Amino acid sequence: MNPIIYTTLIMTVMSGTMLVMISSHWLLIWIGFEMNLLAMIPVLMKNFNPRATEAATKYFLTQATASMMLMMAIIINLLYSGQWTITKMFNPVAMTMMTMALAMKLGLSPFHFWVPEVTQGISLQAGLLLLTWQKLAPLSVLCQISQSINPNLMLTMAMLSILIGGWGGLNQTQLRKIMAYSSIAHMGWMTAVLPYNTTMTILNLLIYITMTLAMFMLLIHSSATTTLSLSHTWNKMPVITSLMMVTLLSMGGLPPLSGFMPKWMIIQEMTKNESIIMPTLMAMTALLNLYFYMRLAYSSSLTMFPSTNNMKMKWQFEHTKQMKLLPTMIVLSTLVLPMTPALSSLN
Amino acid sequence: MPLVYMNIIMAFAIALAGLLMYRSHLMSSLLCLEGMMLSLFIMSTLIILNTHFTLANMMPIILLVFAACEAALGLSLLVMVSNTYGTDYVQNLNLLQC
Amino acid sequence: PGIVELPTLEDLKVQEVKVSSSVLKAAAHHYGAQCDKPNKEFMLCRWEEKDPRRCLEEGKLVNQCALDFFRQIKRHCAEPFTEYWTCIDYSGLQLFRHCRKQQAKFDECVLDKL
Amino acid sequence: LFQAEKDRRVLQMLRENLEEEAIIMKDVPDWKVGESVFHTTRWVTPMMGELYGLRTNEEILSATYGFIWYT
Amino acid sequence: PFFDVQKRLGLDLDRWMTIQSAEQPHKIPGRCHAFEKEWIECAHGIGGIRAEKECKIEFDDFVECLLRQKTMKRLSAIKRQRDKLIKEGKYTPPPHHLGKEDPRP
Amino acid sequence: MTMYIAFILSTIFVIGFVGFSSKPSPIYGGLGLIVSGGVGCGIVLNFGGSFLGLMVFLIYLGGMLVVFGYTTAMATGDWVIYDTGDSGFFSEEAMGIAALYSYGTWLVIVTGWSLLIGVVVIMEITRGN
Amino acid sequence: MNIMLTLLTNVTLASLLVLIAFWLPQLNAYSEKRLPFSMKFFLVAITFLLFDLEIALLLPLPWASQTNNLKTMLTMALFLLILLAASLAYEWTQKGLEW
Amino acid sequence: MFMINILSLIIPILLAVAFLTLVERKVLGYMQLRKGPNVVGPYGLLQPIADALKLFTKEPLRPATSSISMFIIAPILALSLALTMWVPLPMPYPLINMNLGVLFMLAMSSLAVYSILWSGWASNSKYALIGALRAVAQTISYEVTLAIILLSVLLMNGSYTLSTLITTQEHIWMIFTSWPLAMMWFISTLAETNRAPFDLTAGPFAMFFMAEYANIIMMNAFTAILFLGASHDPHTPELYTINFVLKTLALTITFLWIRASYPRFRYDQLMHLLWKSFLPLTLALCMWHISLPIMTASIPPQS
Amino acid sequence: AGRIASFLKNAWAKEPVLVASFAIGGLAIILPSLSPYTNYAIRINRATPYNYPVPLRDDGNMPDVPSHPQDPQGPSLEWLKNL
Amino acid sequence: MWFEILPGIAVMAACLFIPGMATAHIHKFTNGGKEKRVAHFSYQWNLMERDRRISGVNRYHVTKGLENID
Ligand SMILES: CCCCCCCCCCCCCCCCC[C@@H](O)O[C@H](CO[C@H](O)CCCCCCCCCCCCCCC)COP(=O)(O)OCC[N+](C)(C)C
Ligand SMILES: CCCCCCCCCCCCCCCCC[C@@H](O)O[C@H](CO[C@H](O)CCCCCCCCCCCCCCC)COP(=O)(O)OCC[N+](C)(C)C
Ligand SMILES: CCCCCCCC/C=C\CCCCCCCC(=O)O[C@H](COC(=O)CCCCCCC/C=C/CCCCCCCC)COP(=O)(O)OCCN
Ligand SMILES: CCCCCCCC/C=C\CCCCCCCC(=O)O[C@H](COC(=O)CCCCCCC/C=C/CCCCCCCC)COP(=O)(O)OCCN
């Protein structure tokens, strides 16, 4: 598309998210969600193809259903209490439907089926945008009404999301599907501490966003979509493969890397409320995420896969367009564990 | 809580079920979506007018506008789906899979 | 929780004003100009007490004062007022614009008499 | 004048409804005749059903739908 | 999460529509203006937990004004009992409830 | 009491939603949708919201469902919740809706921007390539 | 009630007269013997829908004129019409109105 | 005595649309140096009766393979809307008084396209389907401008009430206040009812014909009331009725004149005409009519 | 100056509709800020009594509030009558 | 000649004369020889209800004049 139109659509997406975050009226929040959905669709369809169109229509159907459920729950809440301000829900039934609407928007299981297919269909830049920025608004809405969420529903959906992400990440070969399942598992981790401490939720959001931004930027730099295309990378830019392996180890939760910060802290918080079984289950389940990250690292950097003759020509040309903030993202996603108490800034 | 609100909520639930069934014909899916929207409009209008909450009379119209825009968007997508396959059958969207 | 108190039907008995809406509209301006003090006392009591049960006496006073006003109209200017309210009653909207002539006749008559 | 007549008519309708409630509810054991449903003692504007609950269906329909149906 | 830009800048972007009793056009009152006002003044600057625990009476009155469930229950009980007596035959409606009354302005 | 006319209209609304909820022959589902929209407009008009009912009956039926049918063809208990007082010498619904321009500046701005962005999005999607 | 009676009378008369027109010539016995999907039609339909939405937004203007905030109301109305004109201009310039 | 009023509003409209065919034939004939029907009856007065009887005694050509449901539904809806749009109008006193009469007329006009859509879909032919799609697109495109011009004109009236239009134009016609809007409304009414130069296209056929002619006369009366106001004396409404009928008949003669006097547009030519000449001027004049009452402190009273 | 005039002359030919539309729109946008009657329109809107004027309670210190409608105190609508 | 078009047009005139006047006459006959009272804005509806209750015949058009003031 035209660069002006693309910039305008990005502005509209960000403005809708900001409107959702800064508004104290339910109708304005719904309007922000509608604007976000309306402007997000062409971004997925920048590179026109049947796969992109199918992913876009799946995403549109899911988001429209979620928005209708959200509006209907708002209507019930208004019925049982004539209040428009975003505060305590005031209705048991309204709360359940709003939670499902926000879970549909986020992608938590069992509403997770659309995420892998939408991520696979669209390009890498669109996948980066979808998996990073589209999650700020529903998470902010959930944080604003954390005192009203039923702990049983939220915690069981978080458990299901972590289990499903861990299990589904093992079978996938394409990198985009692996990233989608990783996002599902990370949000399963993330929404489990909402009833207890939203600061941990925001900290996990920041850390996850940093790691996944680094990961998609590295995947864009070395234009690889399948596992073997990534295995071919070591023959040209071994530094990229090494940095990607370090980032993958960080995303697995291995100390002293940055990815160990959220889980640990989250576990600590859930131990303050005398919840012991669930953090243990979450760690043992995240071992599966670690396993498929380790398999990807084995395929990418720790071993040298067979190359192709034509690769010699790629030796002669340099990466023309260089993306900024990649070194900063890698450093922030790998070596920030000693600055953990900074989470007291209520980030 | 009178029977009118119960009937409207039941209509919304029936429309949601019809949307989630997916026999075929994605056009029917959009129709079920917009039936849910119509039920929402009716319920919101009744609730707002019943309590004489005057400043809330803006809310339904705005709602309708936005929802209709979404419908247009959906229609556009449907068209391209047909243009790719010749028909709007739901089962044609099996290229992307878990 | 609690018992509501309602005045007895003997407390709600008063001589009603048995004239139609058009008759009231015909003399609305003079009624407002002359009957103003009891009207304002009643209405101020109404928005201050915020309770119909605390404003019965002022309602009886406003009914009595309106009856006195209409009795004066009947005594002095019966026929011009009759023509004026007939003209006002004929129209569907009950417009003052239709027959300013009868209004002027009634106004000059009541200015001469009262 | 219209406000005064409205208040008087509303009070009379409420009083008649209270008298009929007292007549009918004489045999119900735990019923308190004329019991408010609000904790506060402030005056509350009655609903349409609180006034025309026990009246004929014709005038109920009039009072609820006449202005809307008058065209 | 909630970046309160409005209170920082004093813009009042969407706070006028939040409640029934906030500057309606032509000063048209809400159906439950008094109850909502009383509850809001009860629960202002007190906190969510304490407002829920302490201002429950005002919120109950507000919900009763909004939905009138108890009024419906009372009216339905009265109507059913009146129907039962008129069926068995120990009650007769007065002329006021038969349309034979003398209406007043 | 006209046999709970609001209840009758609500039941007919539910019957219409059941009718097109089976999704048979999308044109017939559309026809059921016009029927249900007409019933809903009747409910709104009977309640007292004349302008909102007319907004439904005009916008929804005349434009939006007409576009739906165009695209399809191209392819192969009551009366007690009411008030007691009067509205004055005006209709409250009309005043509340007309307050959109004097009060709802933010709503007007966001809705206009959303509509313009929707136009741009439709053009971008339907461009093809 | 009156409008319901009028609508019922209209529909009843229309149905009766159509059925008699359809059945009067049926009493006497006689012999009794795709792909294209043009995009422009859909584009104009969508344009009509969106302009109808903006017209719905513009509709309450007759009552919007009495608000005592004449400057703000005028600015908002002119803003809405300017956005309508800008949408039309954008659809014009990138060949959205071609046959 | 309400059913009598409904019947006395319905039957004369049907008689008028019956004799409108005779009047149109006579006018086009005399505009073409010939005579219209003048053999059947005194001056062709019995021609509509013969036409109706012949149409009702001729067998219907039912396709026997299409959907009979929509095939029979479409004329019902068309005739019902055509007869219903008559009631809101005030001549001088409207049969049914509705605060939002104009919006009701707009909603009926918007619904009028369903008959065309359903007839085209049930015709069971691709060519008829294409023709129906073209007609629907033209109708919706032109009703957009109809609605915008209508609200712009009503901005000087005070409300959507049709009766108030008589009071607004008590001293001067609205034709002088805004003639460009009146001309654009006239052309939009021409194009909405599929009349020349915009007419690109037994029982049910006569049904559709009567619905179309009733729509013509209804739109004519609406235009006459909106833009050409007659003086109304409350003690003698007959003068207003006579003036209104005369203006409506003059407008109908004007449509027959325009049909007889011009060639016809193409589909793309009329679409471009609308979208690139009427809509820009429509928006500009809508802005002007928004700004004018505030500029001159002449805001209409009712609210 | 010359280029703008030449472009306006070119646009007035072969495209008068757009020129008229833009002229009317710009004129309608600009004029209200200059017209002196907009304040009169605002005042007329303010002077229309839609609600009943609730009287104030006398405390002996309200000289600007009239005690009767006929009293000279209070706002006057002679300016509207003169219009 | 051209005036031969006048008869048919005249018929339409008659066919358009019938509705309007008829309604007016009906509006008089049902409403005691006066214009039908229109009810907008819900205030004048209360006026007709008060008139109906005052009249004592349950008809609003029955106008009780000053003679009823005693
Ligand atoms: C990898 C770790 C995350 C890094 C994220 C990127 C770092 C660069 C960001 C640049 C500065 C960020 C914010 C810009 C400063 C101005 C905005 C400021 O006014 O916001 C304040 C808030 O300040 C920010 O929140 C703090 C941002 C600092 C983020 C770093 C914390 C990460 C902890 C663990 C990693 C240690 C740092 C490693 C090096 C960066 C207002 O707070 P308030 O509106 O009243 O409360 C809203 C939150 N509520 C609703 C929950 C109550
Ligand atoms: C402040 C930051 C500016 C730069 C950043 C802008 C961010 C995005 C742009 C959107 C924000 C614009 C702020 C407008 C908020 C509306 C409220 C404020 O403006 O006050 C209004 C003042 O009204 C002004 O006229 C608002 C005019 C602004 C709209 C015109 C241009 C808007 C463009 C914004 C982007 C939209 C798309 C791009 C268009 C070019 C209220 O008027 P007032 O009478 O006191 O109150 C009425 C209520 N009463 C009855 C209780 C008294
Ligand atoms: C101080 C500030 C003053 C305020 C400003 C106001 C001044 C405005 C001045 C200009 C406004 C005039 C606008 C008139 C409408 C413009 C429409 C138009 O221009 O379109 C025509 C087209 O119009 C038509 O051709 C329509 C033909 C349809 C047949 C109708 C025959 C016309 C004769 C019928 C008489 C009209 C009846 C009017 C009175 C009706 C009474 C109700 C041009 O199209 P093209 O030639 O293709 O040019 C574009 C390519 N360059
Ligand atoms: C700031 C005011 C905004 C509000 C007013 C306007 C609201 C509605 C009017 C605008 C509607 C949308 C306009 C869309 C513009 C499209 C431009 C375009 O692309 O058209 C060009 C042609 O148009 C042009 O020539 C460019 C602009 C023409 C003139 C524009 C304005 C010129 C100056 C206006 C003000 C005049 C000076 C003021 C005089 C005051 C009196 C003394 C292409 O021609 P086609 O029709 O596609 O080709 C068909 C034939 N093959």
Q: What are the structure tokens assigned to I47, written together?
A: 């002077």
Question: How many angstroms separate the CA atoms of G37 and F73, rounded?
Answer: 10
User: From the CB of H180, is ligand 3 less than 6 Å away?
Assistant: yes
Q: What are the structure tokens assigned to H175, written together?
A: 């034709």
Q: Which of J57, J58, J41, J40 is nearest to J49 (CA)?
A: J58
Question: How many angstroms separate the CA atoms of J3 and F50, rounded?
Answer: 48
Q: What are the structure tokens assigned to H91, written together?
A: 């001549």
Centroid of chain to Cα H88 = 14
Q: How many C-alpha atoms does J32 have within 13 Å on its Cβ side?
A: 12
User: From the CB of I62, is ligand 4 less than 6 Å away?
Assistant: no
Specify whether the backbone of G51 is left (phi greater than 0), alpha (psi in -120 to 50) or beta. Answer: alpha
Tell me the three-class secondary structure of J29-54, residue by residue: HCCCCCCCCCCCCCCHHHHHHHHHHH
Nearest CA to ligand 3 atom 5: I24
Question: How many angstroms separate the CA atoms of E15 and E36, rounded?
Answer: 16
CB atoms H103 and F58 under 8 Å: yes
Closest chain G residue by Cα to residue H203: G21
* Residue in the block written with tokens 């049910």: H204
Question: How many angstroms separate the CA atoms of C4 and H39, rounded?
Answer: 85
In a domain, B21, yes or no: yes
- Does the bond joining A255 to the residue before it have cis omega, within 30 degrees of 0? no
Q: Which of F125, B17, B30 is nearest to A64 (CA)?
A: B30
Q: What are the structure tokens assigned to H273, written together?
A: 């005409």
In a domain, B93, yes or no: no
Question: How many angstroms separate the CA atoms of E18 and D8, rounded?
Answer: 36
Interface of E with F in 20-49 (CB under 8 A): 24-26, 28, 31
User: Are D68 and F8 in contact, with CB atoms under 8 Å apart?
Assistant: no
Domain residues for G66?
1-94
* Residue in the block written with tokens 């409008």: G3
Question: How many angstroms separate the CA atoms of H89 and H96, rounded?
Answer: 8
How many Cβ atoms sit within 10 Å of the Cβ of residue J9? Answer: 17
Contacts for J58 with CB less than 8 Å, ≥ 6 apart: J52
Q: For residue A143, give the amino acid letter.
A: C
Domain residues for B10?
3-85
Q: How long a stretch of residues is chain J? A: 70
User: How far, in Å, are A156, B15, C63, F112 from residue G73 at the CA level?
Assistant: 50, 39, 44, 15
* Residue in the block written with tokens 């800034």: A345
* CA dihedral over E71, E74, E78, E81, signed as positive or negative: positive
Question: How many angstroms separate the CA atoms of H293 and I32, rounded?
Answer: 10
Q: Which domain CATH number covers B80?
A: 1.10.287.3510
User: How far, in Å, are A159, A176, A227, G62 from residue A286 at the CA level?
Assistant: 11, 19, 21, 62
- State the nearest Cα–Cα gap between G24 and chain H, in angstroms: 7
Question: How many angstroms separate the CA atoms of H63 and H65, rounded?
Answer: 5
User: From the CB of H152, is ligand 3 less than 6 Å away?
Assistant: no
User: Are A209 and A180 in contact, with CB atoms under 8 Å apart?
Assistant: no
Centroid of chain to Cα G69 = 32
Question: How many angstroms separate the CA atoms of C74 and C66, rounded?
Answer: 12
D26 contact C CB<8A: no
Burial (CB < 10 A; 0-12, 13-18, 19+), residue F7, is middle
DSSP-derived letter for residue E105 is -
In a domain, B50, yes or no: yes
User: How far, in Å, are A61, A217, A237, A317, C60 from residue A321 at the CA level?
Assistant: 36, 12, 15, 12, 90
Question: How many angstroms separate the CA atoms of H79 and H82, rounded?
Answer: 5
- ∠ CA(A27), CA(A32), CA(A35), 5° rounding? 125
Q: What are the structure tokens assigned to H203, written together?
A: 């029982």
Q: Quick one: which ligand is closest to A198's CA?
A: 1
Question: How many angstroms separate the CA atoms of F49 and B45, rounded?
Answer: 8
Q: What are the structure tokens assigned to E54, written together?
A: 């302490």
Question: How many angstroms separate the CA atoms of A170 and A159, rounded?
Answer: 18
User: Are A141 and A19 in contact, with CB atoms under 8 Å apart?
Assistant: no
- ∠ CA(B91), CA(B75), CA(F75), 5° rounding? 65
- Name the phi and psi angles at A188, rounded to 5: -60, -45
> Which DSSP string corresponds to A312-324?
HHHTS----S--T
Specify whether the backbone of H302 is left (phi greater than 0), alpha (psi in -120 to 50) or beta. Answer: beta
User: Are F90 and E26 in contact, with CB atoms under 8 Å apart?
Assistant: yes
Centroid of chain to Cα A276 = 26
Question: How many angstroms separate the CA atoms of B15 and B21, rounded?
Answer: 10
Burial (CB < 10 A; 0-12, 13-18, 19+), residue J31, is middle
Contacts for C32 with CB less than 8 Å, ≥ 6 apart: C39, I69
**Chain E residues with CB-CB distance to D16 below 8 A:** 94, 96-97
List chain C gaps (C–N > 2.5 A) by preceding residue. none
Determine the longest span between alpha carbons in chain I, in angstroms: 75
CB atoms D68 and F81 under 8 Å: no
Q: Which of A340, A324, A336 is nearest to A214 (CA)?
A: A324
* CA dihedral over A118, A123, A129, A132, signed as positive or negative: positive
User: Are F105 and G76 in contact, with CB atoms under 8 Å apart?
Assistant: yes
Question: How many angstroms separate the CA atoms of I75 and I58, rounded?
Answer: 18
User: How far, in Å, are C41, H16, H83, H93, H230 from residue H214 at the CA level?
Assistant: 60, 8, 7, 20, 22
User: From the CB of F106, is ligand 2 less than 6 Å away?
Assistant: yes
Of the partner residues B4, B15, B87, the one whose CB lies closest to the CB of residue F76 = B87
Strand, helix or coil for residue H39? coil
What's the first-to-final CA gap in chain H, in angstroms?
32
DSSP-derived letter for residue E13 is S
**Chain J residues with CB-CB distance to F88 below 8 A:** 41-43
In a domain, G99, yes or no: no
Q: What are the percentages of helix, strand and coil residues in chain I, rounded to 5?
A: 50, 0, 50
How many Cβ atoms sit within 10 Å of the Cβ of residue H155? Answer: 21
Burial (CB < 10 A; 0-12, 13-18, 19+), residue F43, is buried
| Number of independent structural domains in chain G | 1
Q: Which of E101, E68, E77, E103 is nearest to D21 (CA)?
A: E77
Q: What are the structure tokens assigned to F118, written together?
A: 């929707």
Question: How many angstroms separate the CA atoms of A262 and A199, rounded?
Answer: 11
Question: How many angstroms separate the CA atoms of G11 and H77, rounded?
Answer: 8
Contacts for D30 with CB less than 8 Å, ≥ 6 apart: none
Nearest CA to ligand 1 atom 49: E1
Tell me the three-class secondary structure of A115-166, residue by residue: HHHHHHHCCHHHHHHHHHHHHHHHHHHHHHCCCCCCHHHHHHHHHHHHHHHH
What's the first-to-final CA gap in chain F, in angstroms?
62
In a domain, B96, yes or no: no
| Residues pairing with D35 in the sheet | C3
Strand, helix or coil for residue I36? coil
- ∠ CA(B18), CA(B20), CA(B25), 5° rounding? 70
Centroid of chain to Cα A68 = 23
Question: How many angstroms separate the CA atoms of I21 and H186, rounded?
Answer: 19
User: How far, in Å, are C5, H227, H229 from residue H176 at the CA level?
Assistant: 64, 9, 11
Q: What are the structure tokens assigned to A31, written together?
A: 């309007």
Interface of H with J in 163-182 (CB under 8 A): 163
Q: What are the structure tokens assigned to A203, written together?
A: 């900290």
Q: What are the structure tokens assigned to B81, written together?
A: 């789906």
Strand, helix or coil for residue A81? coil
User: Are J63 and C23 in contact, with CB atoms under 8 Å apart?
Assistant: yes
Closest chain A residue by Cα to residue F107: A28
Contacts for F62 with CB less than 8 Å, ≥ 6 apart: G52, H106, H107, H109, H110, H111, H113, H143
In a domain, B44, yes or no: yes
DSSP-derived letter for residue E25 is G
* Residue in the block written with tokens 């598992």: A185
User: Are H275 and G97 in contact, with CB atoms under 8 Å apart?
Assistant: yes
Rounded to a whole number of angstroms, the CA Rg of chain A reads: 20
Which of the other chains make 3 or more beta carbon contacts under 8 angstroms with chain B?
A, E, F, G
Where would I find the H helices in F3-104? 5-21, 26-47, 50-55, 66-74, 92-102
CB atoms F126 and G43 under 8 Å: yes
User: From the CB of F101, is ligand 2 less than 6 Å away?
Assistant: no
User: From the CB of I24, is ligand 3 less than 6 Å away?
Assistant: yes
Question: How many angstroms separate the CA atoms of A296 and A305, rounded?
Answer: 12
Specify whether the backbone of H64 is left (phi greater than 0), alpha (psi in -120 to 50) or beta. Answer: left
* CA dihedral over C92, C94, C98, C99, signed as positive or negative: positive
> Which DSSP string corresponds to A153-209?
HHHHHHHHHHHHHHHHHHH--SHHHHHHHHHHHHHHHHHTTTTT-HHHHHHHHHHHH
User: From the CB of G41, is ligand 2 less than 6 Å away?
Assistant: no
| Best mutation site among I14, I19, I24, I27 for ligand 3 pocket (most ligand atoms within 8 Å of CB) | I24
Q: What are the structure tokens assigned to C37, written together?
A: 């003090």
- Name the phi and psi angles at J66, rounded to 5: -65, -25
Strand, helix or coil for residue C3? strand
User: How far, in Å, are B32, B76, D15, I9 from residue B25 at the CA level?
Assistant: 11, 15, 62, 55
- Name the phi and psi angles at C94, rounded to 5: 55, 60
CATH number of F5-127: 1.20.120.1200
- Name the phi and psi angles at D19, rounded to 5: -60, -45
DSSP-derived letter for residue C17 is -
Nearest CA to ligand 2 atom 13: F106
User: Are A25 and E17 in contact, with CB atoms under 8 Å apart?
Assistant: yes
> Which DSSP string corresponds to C42-111?
HHHHHHHH--GGG-HHHHHHHHHHHHHHHHHHHHH-HHHHHHHHHHHHHSSS--TTTTHHHHHHHHHHHH
* Residue in the block written with tokens 């003079």: C30
Determine the longest span between alpha carbons in chain A, in angstroms: 71
* CA dihedral over D11, D17, D23, D29, signed as positive or negative: negative
Q: Which of C29, G4, D41, H8 is nearest to J16 (CA)?
A: H8
- State the nearest Cα–Cα gap between B92 and chain F, in angstroms: 16
Centroid of chain to Cα A50 = 25
Q: What are the structure tokens assigned to A216, written together?
A: 């998609």
Burial (CB < 10 A; 0-12, 13-18, 19+), residue I1, is exposed
Question: How many angstroms separate the CA atoms of G52 and H141, rounded?
Answer: 10
Give the method used.
cryo-EM
Tell me the three-class secondary structure of H15-68, residue by residue: HHHHHHHHHHHHHHHHCCCCCCCCCCCCCCCCHHHHHHHHHHCCCCCCCCCCCH
Question: How many angstroms separate the CA atoms of B20 and B36, rounded?
Answer: 12
User: Are A79 and B48 in contact, with CB atoms under 8 Å apart?
Assistant: no
User: Are E55 and A70 in contact, with CB atoms under 8 Å apart?
Assistant: no
User: Are A224 and A233 in contact, with CB atoms under 8 Å apart?
Assistant: yes
- State the nearest Cα–Cα gap between G16 and chain F, in angstroms: 21
Q: Quick one: which ligand is closest to G72's CA?
A: 2
| Number of independent structural domains in chain B | 1
User: Are B66 and A46 in contact, with CB atoms under 8 Å apart?
Assistant: no
User: Are A54 and A64 in contact, with CB atoms under 8 Å apart?
Assistant: no
Tell me the three-class secondary structure of B24-86, residue by residue: CCHHHHHHHHHHHHHHHHHHHHHHHHHCCCHHHHHHHHHHHHHHHHHHHHHHHHHHHHHHHHC
- Name the phi and psi angles at H94, rounded to 5: -70, 145
Nearest CA to ligand 3 atom 38: H183
User: How far, in Å, are D37, E75, E90, G78 from residue D25 at the CA level?
Assistant: 17, 12, 12, 63
Question: How many angstroms separate the CA atoms of H269 and H259, rounded?
Answer: 17
User: Are H158 and H164 in contact, with CB atoms under 8 Å apart?
Assistant: yes
User: From the CB of A343, is ligand 1 less than 6 Å away?
Assistant: yes
* Residue in the block written with tokens 């007690």: F80
F70 contact I CB<8A: no
DSSP-derived letter for residue E22 is S
- Name the phi and psi angles at A29, rounded to 5: -65, -45
| Residues pairing with H90 in the sheet | H94
CB atoms G39 and F128 under 8 Å: yes
CB atoms C36 and I55 under 8 Å: no
Q: For residue H26, give the amino acid letter.
A: K
How many Cβ atoms sit within 10 Å of the Cβ of residue F36? Answer: 26
**Chain F residues with CB-CB distance to E24 below 8 A:** 96
* Per-position b or e across I45-79, b if 16+ CB within 10 A of its CB: beeeeeeeeeeeeeeeeeeeeeeeeeeeeeeeeee
Q: Which of A97, A47, A110, A36 is nearest to A68 (CA)?
A: A97
Question: How many angstroms separate the CA atoms of A278 and A159, rounded?
Answer: 8
Q: Which of J11, E56, A254 is nearest to H19 (CA)?
A: J11
Rounded to a whole number of angstroms, the CA Rg of chain I reads: 25
Centroid of chain to Cα A22 = 21
- State the nearest Cα–Cα gap between D6 and chain C, in angstroms: 9
Q: Which of C77, C73, C55 is nearest to C17 (CA)?
A: C73
Q: For residue B98, give the amino acid letter.
A: C
